[PDB]
């Protein structure tokens, strides 16, 4: 299970940029 | 040494009246050129060097022409020993000086790994080398190769 | 007995300096020989080599085993053959920044290099000048940093502090001899000094690859397939594929945005067509059976840029005809446009961008040999003037300013002596020794001085 | 010779046509443009080979349930079962087809395996059809310059 | 044509001056003399 969860694990590393 | 046809009767007769013959009719040849060849060899290339600096800061002088024609026998042994080099010494003099160049040292600068090192330099200092410090990264070229040249020589 | 087994370890170090790259190129056959004869597996969940008549099992066992110790061999030649020379290098750059600009006395560095923080530990050792062919480095920032910041502040950073102090005492009517014990040379040697060159050589990326290299053989033992990543040596190592592969490694930079660009160009399609072809993406096989549409945003992308891009003719080519109403003449205007703009503007630009490298690359070679050919690289009069006299630029590169003959100059002065010196010889020593460089000869030269 | 063995055969009269390019020089301004590199053509089509190979051996560790080129169906034949028939495989159909290898082989809807398998066709298309024949004629088109 | 256009620029600003049109072998007679002349002499800057 890795063809949809791929785009989802990248975009949330950006929360971090997100809060600032 | 006669089958050479290099020494004639004379210099025949001098360098076997200049051998040891210690009774027993046998010299150890290795000695005998390390006692007559070494100060010989420093000696003929300093005359090399004056007579060379003669020449070129003296042309147009027959009487010294003549001279350079009898003393090219010994001249073409030093050839490949002597540099020269235009330095800029006195104010707005160009100066032509000389120096002794090693045998080691050119023996390893002819390296295909020098060679290639060498070329790569002038490639990539004629397209994105500078014109204010050319002379700034030939002498760090110069050094790091002269530094391989060393550690080849000491392998 | 100590003797002995020194001048063996120097024999054989130098053996391994000698043959680095003939143990390449070795290395190199041994990979070659093992991804030939990894051509004979066969699968049964199991990988099986049953394909000849013997004598190809276990040579490939052997043929592993030589070849990692043939990559310990290389790495360890290199660390004999290179390391010297970056090490050389570090030294050299760190001391003429020390003299020349102060740098850890009054330029103190950024925390954005490494190397200038890194560099900070070798100061204040004891041979922090192993390989420059010189030592008074010190002495003479000393000399120049000594009244206009501490005598003892300077001393301090730059080690020898204590040494100098019983240097200076023992100047007296007090000085032993130092002995020598075998076998407790572990004190005498510099754990500072070394830790330091660990690091340098651990930076270096050329060991790193080598590292690279040895680990991926390794781990060929415990899978006989790591072999094949032996093969990017023909790239990534010898230079007789760098005509070829600097075409492409020449733009880099505008093929990863040529790339981004049909990315996005691509994402524009697919929004279009999520936005307005909904029942023509029905991939549906045996009929019946539809799947694979443009039901989601990401699906459809996917299947854009994975089926639309190497189609060949375009995307019309993979969907429904279109026959429908209201959409006859946009749909075909949708496909003629993604052909004429994704697969042949797009990728001619890929193919513009690779043909031009060979250009500019042989443009550069060129114009390295004409400004070789026409110009002196030292005093640069030009090719008109010396073509006076008969053979004249030839004879003025080849015996007046040759390169060679300069570095053979440099070479002799370095090696020579310090106080045997001649004028013209010191003078120029002392020009080398402040860095200046006036007694190269600018645009003058034998010829134009005189007649 | 030929022209001798042309009497026992009359068919090795078709390599006297060879004559017409190793013989008058009516045809060097374009045989030059592909004979001047030569080296660099070679070495590209080794270079081609290793890439090949190396996407070669990441198929048959990694995909296994894709060759599956059977005809009329349960004749499972020209798999991946074998090193060197996956590298002919690869060599002979992917290079050729025109769009990669990710059109010649079953379609990656598995799991584990359904974006792996598109990066590796996707990548194999760009770096062995797009970038790997652009240097192949760019070393033909700057041979005439 | 783009890299011809770039080259035939960078040429033009390293052979002549932009203000005076010299040339450089003239001003490359006293040493490092052209690259004076357009930083002291002819400054764009400086006309600015
Ligand atoms: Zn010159
Ligand atoms: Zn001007």
Same mark, same amino acid.
């Given at each position: ?20 | ?155 | ?30 990979? $070659?020989?093992? &991804?030939?004869?990894?051509? !004979?597996? =066969?699968?049964? +969940?199991?990988?099986?080599?049953? @394909?000849?008549? *013997? ?72 041979? $922090?000048?192993? &390989?420059?062919?010189?030592? !008074?480095? =010190?002495?003479? +920032?000393?000399?120049?940093?000594? @009244?206009?910041? *501490? ?301």
């Amino acid at each position: 299970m890795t063809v949809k969860d791929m785009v989802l694990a990248f975009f949330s590393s950006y929360w971090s940029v997100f809060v600032t | 040494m006669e089958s050479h046809k290099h020494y004639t009767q004379s210099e025949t007769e001098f360098l076997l009246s200049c051998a040891e013959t210690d009774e027993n009719e046998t010299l150890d040849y290795e000695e005998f050129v390390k006692r007559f060849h070494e100060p010989a060899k420093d000696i003929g290339f300093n005359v090399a060097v004056l007579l060379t600096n003669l020449s070129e800061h003296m042309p147009n002088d027959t009487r010294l022409q003549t001279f350079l024609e009898l003393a090219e026998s010994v001249l073409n042994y030093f050839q490949p020993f002597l540099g020269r080099i235009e330095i800029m010494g006195s104010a707005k003099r160009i100066e032509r000086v000389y120096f002794e160049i090693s045998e080691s040292s050119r023996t390893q600068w002819e390296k295909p790994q020098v060679k290639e090192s060498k070329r790569q330099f002038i490639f990539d200092v004629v397209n994105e080398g500078g014109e204010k410090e050319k002379m700034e990264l030939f002498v760090n070229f110069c050094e790091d190769t002269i530094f391989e040249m060393q550690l080849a020589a000491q392998i | 007995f100590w003797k002995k087994i020194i001048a063996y370890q120097q024999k054989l170090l130098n053996y391994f300096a000698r043959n680095f790259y003939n143990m390449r190129m070795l290395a190199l056959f041994v990979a $070659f020989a093992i &991804n030939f004869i990894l051509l !004979f597996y =066969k699968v049964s +969940v199991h990988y099986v080599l049953e @394909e000849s008549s *013997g004598y190809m099992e276990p040579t490939l066992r052997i043929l592993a085993i030589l070849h990692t110790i043939i990559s310990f061999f290389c790495i360890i030649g290199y660390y004999c053959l290179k390391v010297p020379l970056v090490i050389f290098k570090r030294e050299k750059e760190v001391a003429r920044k020390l003299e020349f600009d102060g740098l850890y006395i009054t330029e103190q560095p950024s925390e954005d290099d490494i190397k200038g923080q890194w560099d900070r530990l070798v100061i204040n050792t004891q041979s $922090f000048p192993n &390989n420059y062919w010189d030592k !008074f480095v =010190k002495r003479k +920032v000393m000399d120049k940093y000594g @009244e206009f910041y *501490g005598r003892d502040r300077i001393s301090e950073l730059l080690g020898m502090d204590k040494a100098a102090l019983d240097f200076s005492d023992a100047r007296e009517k007090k000085k032993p001899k130092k002995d020598s014990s075998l076998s407790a040379v572990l004190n005498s040697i510099d754990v500072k000094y070394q830790m330091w060159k660990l690091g340098v050589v651990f930076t270096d990326n050329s060991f790193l690859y080598l590292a690279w290299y040895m680990t991926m053989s390794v781990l060929g033992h415990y899978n006989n397939f790591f072999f094949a990543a032996h093969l990017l040596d023909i790239a990534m190592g010898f230079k007789t594929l760098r005509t070829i592969l600097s075409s492409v490694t020449h733009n880099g930079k505008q093929l990863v945005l040529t790339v981004g660009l049909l990315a996005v160009v691509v994402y524009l399609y697919t929004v279009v067509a999520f936005n307005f072809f909904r029942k023509f993406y029905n991939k549906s096989e045996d009929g019946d059976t539809p799947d694979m549409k443009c039901d989601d945003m990401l699906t459809c992308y996917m299947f854009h840029m994975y089926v639309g891009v190497r189609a060949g003719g375009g995307i019309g080519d993979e969907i429904e005809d279109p026959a429908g109403d209201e959409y006859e003449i946009y749909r075909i205007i949708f496909d003629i446009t993604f052909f004429f703009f994704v697969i042949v503007i797009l990728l001619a630009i890929i193919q513009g961008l690779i043909i031009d490298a060979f250009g500019e690359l042989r443009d550069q070679q060129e114009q390295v040999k004409e400004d070789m050919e026409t110009k002196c690289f030292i005093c640069g009069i030009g090719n008109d003037y010396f073509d006076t006299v008969p053979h004249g630029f030839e004879t003025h590169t080849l015996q007046e300013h040759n390169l060679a003959n300069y570095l053979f100059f440099l070479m002799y002065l370095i090696n020579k002596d310090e106080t045997e010196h001649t004028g013209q010889e010191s003078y120029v020593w002392k020009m080398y020794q402040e860095r200046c460089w006036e007694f190269f000869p600018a645009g003058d030269c034998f010829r134009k001085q005189y007649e």
